[PDB]
JSON list of C-alpha atoms in Angstrom, two decimals:
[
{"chain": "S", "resi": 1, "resn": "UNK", "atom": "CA", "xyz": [0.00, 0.00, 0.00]},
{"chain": "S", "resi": 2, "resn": "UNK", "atom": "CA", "xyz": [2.80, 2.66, 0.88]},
{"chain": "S", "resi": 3, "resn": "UNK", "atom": "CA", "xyz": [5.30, 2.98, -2.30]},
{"chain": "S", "resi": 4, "resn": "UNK", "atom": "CA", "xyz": [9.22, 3.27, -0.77]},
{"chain": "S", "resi": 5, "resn": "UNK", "atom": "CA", "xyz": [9.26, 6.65, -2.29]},
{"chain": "S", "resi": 6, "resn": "UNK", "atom": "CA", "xyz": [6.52, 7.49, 0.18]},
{"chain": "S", "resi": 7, "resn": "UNK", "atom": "CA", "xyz": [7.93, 5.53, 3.01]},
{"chain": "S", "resi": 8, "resn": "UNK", "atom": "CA", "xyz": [11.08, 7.46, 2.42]},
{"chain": "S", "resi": 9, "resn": "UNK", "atom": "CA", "xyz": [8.79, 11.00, 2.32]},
{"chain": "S", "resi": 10, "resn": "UNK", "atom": "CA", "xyz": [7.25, 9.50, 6.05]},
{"chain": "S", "resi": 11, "resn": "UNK", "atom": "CA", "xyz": [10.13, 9.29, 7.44]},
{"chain": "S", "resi": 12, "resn": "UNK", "atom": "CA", "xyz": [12.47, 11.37, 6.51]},
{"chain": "S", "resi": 13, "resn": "UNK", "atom": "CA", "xyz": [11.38, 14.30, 4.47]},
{"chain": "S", "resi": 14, "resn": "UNK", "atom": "CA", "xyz": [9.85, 17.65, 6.99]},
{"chain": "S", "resi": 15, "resn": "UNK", "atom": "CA", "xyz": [9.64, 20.57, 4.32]},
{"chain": "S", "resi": 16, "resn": "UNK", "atom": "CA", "xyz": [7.74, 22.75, 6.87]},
{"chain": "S", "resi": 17, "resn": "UNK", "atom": "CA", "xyz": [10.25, 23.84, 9.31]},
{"chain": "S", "resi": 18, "resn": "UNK", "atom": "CA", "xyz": [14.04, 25.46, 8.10]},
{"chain": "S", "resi": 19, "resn": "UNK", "atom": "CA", "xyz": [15.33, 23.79, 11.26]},
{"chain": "S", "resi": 20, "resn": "UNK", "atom": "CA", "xyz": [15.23, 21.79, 13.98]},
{"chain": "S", "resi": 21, "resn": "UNK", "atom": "CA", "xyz": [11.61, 23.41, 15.53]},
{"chain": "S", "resi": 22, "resn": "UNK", "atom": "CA", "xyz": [12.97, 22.68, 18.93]},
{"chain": "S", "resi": 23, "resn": "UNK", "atom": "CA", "xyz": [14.59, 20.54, 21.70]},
{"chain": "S", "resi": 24, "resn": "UNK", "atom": "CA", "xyz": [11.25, 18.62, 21.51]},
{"chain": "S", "resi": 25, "resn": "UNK", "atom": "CA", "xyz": [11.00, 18.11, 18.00]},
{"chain": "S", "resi": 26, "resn": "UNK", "atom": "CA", "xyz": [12.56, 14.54, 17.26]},
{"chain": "S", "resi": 27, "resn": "UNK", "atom": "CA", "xyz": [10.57, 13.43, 20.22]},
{"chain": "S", "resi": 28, "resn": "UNK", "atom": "CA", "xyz": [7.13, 14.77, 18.54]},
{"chain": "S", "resi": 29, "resn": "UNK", "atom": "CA", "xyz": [8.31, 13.82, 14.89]},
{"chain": "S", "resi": 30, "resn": "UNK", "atom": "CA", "xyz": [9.35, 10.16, 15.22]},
{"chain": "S", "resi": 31, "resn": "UNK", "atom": "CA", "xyz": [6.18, 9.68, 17.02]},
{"chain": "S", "resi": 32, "resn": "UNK", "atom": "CA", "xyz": [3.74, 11.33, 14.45]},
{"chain": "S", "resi": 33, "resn": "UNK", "atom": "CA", "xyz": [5.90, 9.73, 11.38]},
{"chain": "S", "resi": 34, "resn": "UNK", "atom": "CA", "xyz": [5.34, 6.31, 13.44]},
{"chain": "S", "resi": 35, "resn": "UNK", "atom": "CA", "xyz": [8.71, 5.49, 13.82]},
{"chain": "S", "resi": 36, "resn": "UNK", "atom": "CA", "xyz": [8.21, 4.76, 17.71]},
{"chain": "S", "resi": 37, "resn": "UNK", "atom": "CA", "xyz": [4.88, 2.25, 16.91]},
{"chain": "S", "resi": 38, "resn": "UNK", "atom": "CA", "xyz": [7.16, -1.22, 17.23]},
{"chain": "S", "resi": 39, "resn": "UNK", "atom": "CA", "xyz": [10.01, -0.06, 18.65]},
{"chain": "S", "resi": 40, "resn": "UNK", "atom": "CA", "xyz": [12.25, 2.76, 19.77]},
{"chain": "S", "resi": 41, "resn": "UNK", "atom": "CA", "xyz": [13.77, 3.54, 15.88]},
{"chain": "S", "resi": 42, "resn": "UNK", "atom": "CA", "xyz": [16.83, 4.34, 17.49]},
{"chain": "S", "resi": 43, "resn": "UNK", "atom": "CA", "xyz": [18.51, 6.42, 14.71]},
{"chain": "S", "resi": 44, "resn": "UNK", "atom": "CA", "xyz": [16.85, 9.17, 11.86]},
{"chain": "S", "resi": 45, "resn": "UNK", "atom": "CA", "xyz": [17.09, 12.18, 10.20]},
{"chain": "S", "resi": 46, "resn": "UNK", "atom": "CA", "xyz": [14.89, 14.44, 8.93]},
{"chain": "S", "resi": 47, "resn": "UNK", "atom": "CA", "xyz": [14.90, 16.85, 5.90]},
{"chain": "S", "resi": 48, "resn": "UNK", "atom": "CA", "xyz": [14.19, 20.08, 5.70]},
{"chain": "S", "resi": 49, "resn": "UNK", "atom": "CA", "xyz": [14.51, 20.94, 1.58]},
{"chain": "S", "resi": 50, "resn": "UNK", "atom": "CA", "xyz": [11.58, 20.99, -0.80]},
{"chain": "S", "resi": 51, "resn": "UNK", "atom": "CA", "xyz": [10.78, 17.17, -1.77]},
{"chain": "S", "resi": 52, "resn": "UNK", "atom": "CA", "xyz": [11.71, 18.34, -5.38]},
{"chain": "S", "resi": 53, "resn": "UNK", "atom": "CA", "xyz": [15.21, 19.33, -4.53]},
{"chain": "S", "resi": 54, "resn": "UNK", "atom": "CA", "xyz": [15.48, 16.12, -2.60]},
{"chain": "S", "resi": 55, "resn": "UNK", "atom": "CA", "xyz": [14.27, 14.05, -5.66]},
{"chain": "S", "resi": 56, "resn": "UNK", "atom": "CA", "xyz": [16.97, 15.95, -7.76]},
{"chain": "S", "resi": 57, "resn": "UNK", "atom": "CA", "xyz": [19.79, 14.42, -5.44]},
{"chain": "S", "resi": 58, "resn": "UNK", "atom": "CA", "xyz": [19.17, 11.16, -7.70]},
{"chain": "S", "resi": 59, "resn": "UNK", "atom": "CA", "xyz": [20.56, 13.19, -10.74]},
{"chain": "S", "resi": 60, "resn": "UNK", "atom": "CA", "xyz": [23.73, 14.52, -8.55]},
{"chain": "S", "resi": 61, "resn": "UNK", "atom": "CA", "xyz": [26.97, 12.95, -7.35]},
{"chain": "S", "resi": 62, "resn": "UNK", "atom": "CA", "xyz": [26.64, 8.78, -7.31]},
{"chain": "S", "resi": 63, "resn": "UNK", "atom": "CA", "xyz": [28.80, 7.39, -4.64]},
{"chain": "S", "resi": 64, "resn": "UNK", "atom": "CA", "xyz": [28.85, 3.78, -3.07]},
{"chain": "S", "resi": 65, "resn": "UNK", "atom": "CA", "xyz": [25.73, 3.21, -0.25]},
{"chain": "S", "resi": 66, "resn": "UNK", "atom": "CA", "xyz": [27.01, 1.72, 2.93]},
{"chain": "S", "resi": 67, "resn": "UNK", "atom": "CA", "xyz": [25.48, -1.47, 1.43]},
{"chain": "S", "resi": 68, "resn": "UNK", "atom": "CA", "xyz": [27.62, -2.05, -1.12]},
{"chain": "S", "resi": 69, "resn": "UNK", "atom": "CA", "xyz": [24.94, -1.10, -3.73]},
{"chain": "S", "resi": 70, "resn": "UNK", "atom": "CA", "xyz": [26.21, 1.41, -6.09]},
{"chain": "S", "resi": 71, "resn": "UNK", "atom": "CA", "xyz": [22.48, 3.61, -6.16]},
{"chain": "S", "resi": 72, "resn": "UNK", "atom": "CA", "xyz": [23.34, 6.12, -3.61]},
{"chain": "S", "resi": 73, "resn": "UNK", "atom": "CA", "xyz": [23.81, 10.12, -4.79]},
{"chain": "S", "resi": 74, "resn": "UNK", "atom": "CA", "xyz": [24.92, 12.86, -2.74]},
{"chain": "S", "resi": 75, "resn": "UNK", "atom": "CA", "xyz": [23.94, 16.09, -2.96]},
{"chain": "S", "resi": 76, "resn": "UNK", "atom": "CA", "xyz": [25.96, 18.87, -4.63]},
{"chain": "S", "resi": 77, "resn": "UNK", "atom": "CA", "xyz": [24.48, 21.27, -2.49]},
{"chain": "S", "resi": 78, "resn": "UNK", "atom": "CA", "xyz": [24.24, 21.26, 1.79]},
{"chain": "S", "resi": 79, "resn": "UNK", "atom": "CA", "xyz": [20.68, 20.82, 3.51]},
{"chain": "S", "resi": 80, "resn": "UNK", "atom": "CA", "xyz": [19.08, 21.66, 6.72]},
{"chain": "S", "resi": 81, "resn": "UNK", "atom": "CA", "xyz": [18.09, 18.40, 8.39]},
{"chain": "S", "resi": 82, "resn": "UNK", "atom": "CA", "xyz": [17.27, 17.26, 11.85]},
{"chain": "S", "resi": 83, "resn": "UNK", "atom": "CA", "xyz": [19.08, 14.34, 13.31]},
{"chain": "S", "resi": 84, "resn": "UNK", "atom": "CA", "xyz": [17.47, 11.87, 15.78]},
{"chain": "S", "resi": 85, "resn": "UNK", "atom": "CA", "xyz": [19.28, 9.85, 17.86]},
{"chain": "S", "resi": 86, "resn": "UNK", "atom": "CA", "xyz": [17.28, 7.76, 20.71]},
{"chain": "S", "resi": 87, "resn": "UNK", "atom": "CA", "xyz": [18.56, 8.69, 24.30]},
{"chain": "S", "resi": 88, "resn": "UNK", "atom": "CA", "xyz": [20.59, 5.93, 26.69]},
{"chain": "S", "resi": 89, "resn": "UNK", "atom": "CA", "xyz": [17.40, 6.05, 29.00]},
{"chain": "S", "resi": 90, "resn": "UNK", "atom": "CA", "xyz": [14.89, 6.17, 26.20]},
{"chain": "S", "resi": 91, "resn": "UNK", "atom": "CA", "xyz": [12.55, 2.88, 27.28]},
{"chain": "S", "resi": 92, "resn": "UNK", "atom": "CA", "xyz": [9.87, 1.86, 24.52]},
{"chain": "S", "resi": 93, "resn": "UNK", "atom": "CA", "xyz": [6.95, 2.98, 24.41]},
{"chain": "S", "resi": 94, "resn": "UNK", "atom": "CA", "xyz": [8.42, 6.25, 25.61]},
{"chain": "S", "resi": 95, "resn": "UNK", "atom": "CA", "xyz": [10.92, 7.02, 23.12]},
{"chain": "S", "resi": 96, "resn": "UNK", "atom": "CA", "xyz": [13.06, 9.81, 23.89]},
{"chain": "S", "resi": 97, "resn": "UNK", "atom": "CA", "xyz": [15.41, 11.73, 21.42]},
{"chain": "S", "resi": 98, "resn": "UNK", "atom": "CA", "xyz": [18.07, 14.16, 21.33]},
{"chain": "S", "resi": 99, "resn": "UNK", "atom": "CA", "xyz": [17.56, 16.47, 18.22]},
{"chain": "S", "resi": 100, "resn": "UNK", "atom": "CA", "xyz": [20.35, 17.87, 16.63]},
{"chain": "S", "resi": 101, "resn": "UNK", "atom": "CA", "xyz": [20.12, 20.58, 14.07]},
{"chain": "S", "resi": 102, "resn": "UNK", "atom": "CA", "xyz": [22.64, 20.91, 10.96]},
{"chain": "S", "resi": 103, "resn": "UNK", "atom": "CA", "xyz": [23.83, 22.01, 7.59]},
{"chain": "S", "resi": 104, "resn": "UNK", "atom": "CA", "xyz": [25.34, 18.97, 5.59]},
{"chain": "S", "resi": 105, "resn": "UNK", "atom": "CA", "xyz": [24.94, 17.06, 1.97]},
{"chain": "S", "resi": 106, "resn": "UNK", "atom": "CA", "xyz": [22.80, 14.17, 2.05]},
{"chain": "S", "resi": 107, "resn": "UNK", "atom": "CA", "xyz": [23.62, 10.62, 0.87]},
{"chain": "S", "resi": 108, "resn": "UNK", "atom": "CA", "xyz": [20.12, 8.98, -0.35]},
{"chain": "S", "resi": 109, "resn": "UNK", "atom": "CA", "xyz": [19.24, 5.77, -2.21]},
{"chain": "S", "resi": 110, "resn": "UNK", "atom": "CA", "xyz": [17.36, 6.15, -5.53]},
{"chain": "S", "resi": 111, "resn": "UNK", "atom": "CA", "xyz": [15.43, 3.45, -7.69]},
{"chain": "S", "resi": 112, "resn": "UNK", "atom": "CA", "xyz": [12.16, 3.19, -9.50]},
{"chain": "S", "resi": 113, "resn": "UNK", "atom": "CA", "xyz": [10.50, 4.51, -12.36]},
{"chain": "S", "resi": 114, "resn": "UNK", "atom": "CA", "xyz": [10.69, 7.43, -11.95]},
{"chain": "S", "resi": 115, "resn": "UNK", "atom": "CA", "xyz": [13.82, 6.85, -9.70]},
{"chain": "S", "resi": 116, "resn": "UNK", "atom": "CA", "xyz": [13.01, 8.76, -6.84]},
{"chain": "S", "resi": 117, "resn": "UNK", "atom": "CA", "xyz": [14.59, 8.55, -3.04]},
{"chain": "S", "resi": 118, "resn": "UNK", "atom": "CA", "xyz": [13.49, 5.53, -1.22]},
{"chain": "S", "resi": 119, "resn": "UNK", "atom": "CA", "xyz": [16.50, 5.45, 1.60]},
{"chain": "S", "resi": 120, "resn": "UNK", "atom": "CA", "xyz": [18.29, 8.08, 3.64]},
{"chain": "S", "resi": 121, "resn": "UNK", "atom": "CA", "xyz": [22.23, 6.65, 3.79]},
{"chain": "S", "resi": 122, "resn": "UNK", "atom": "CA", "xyz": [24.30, 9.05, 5.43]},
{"chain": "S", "resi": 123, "resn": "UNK", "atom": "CA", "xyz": [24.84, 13.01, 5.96]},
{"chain": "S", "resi": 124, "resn": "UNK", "atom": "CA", "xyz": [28.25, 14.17, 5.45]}
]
């Protein structure tokens, strides 16, 4: 029923906000994307770009995923994102997050027809 390229938009793309909204923020967002519904996802980032300048990262610079696979692109350009990272005494179903604001290129995943973003690999 969900596509990837809409999986990927659910979790990682937030267009709305330039920046990190606030010290509460990962612990609202990876509730409200349902990334807290089976467990504590203990790692994610966030996105804060148009969706169509994060689709053109598929058409920029193709480097190696962590994977191995060779469909990974980073993007020419730096991004605001958000990243989440689950707290030491973050117990499910209370997940807890530190939110960290910054400026860096993303590393995404592309396939499909149209080859879109369907996998956030790395900021850098």
């Amino acid at each position: 029923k969900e596509t990837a390229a809409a999986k990927f938009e659910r979790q990682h793309m937030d267009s709305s906000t330039s920046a990190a909204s606030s010290s509460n923020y990962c612990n609202q967002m990876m509730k409200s994307r349902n990334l807290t519904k089976d467990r504590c996802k203990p790692v994610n980032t966030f996105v804060h770009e148009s969706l169509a300048d994060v689709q053109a990262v598929c058409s920029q610079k193709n480097v190696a995923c962590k994977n191995g696979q060779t469909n990974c692109y980073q993007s020419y350009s730096t991004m605001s994102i958000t990243d989440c990272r689950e707290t030491g005494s973050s117990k499910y179903p209370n997940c807890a997050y530190k939110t960290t604001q910054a400026n860096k290129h993303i590393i995404v995943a592309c396939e499909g027809n149209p080859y879109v973003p369907v996998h956030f690999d790395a900021s850098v």
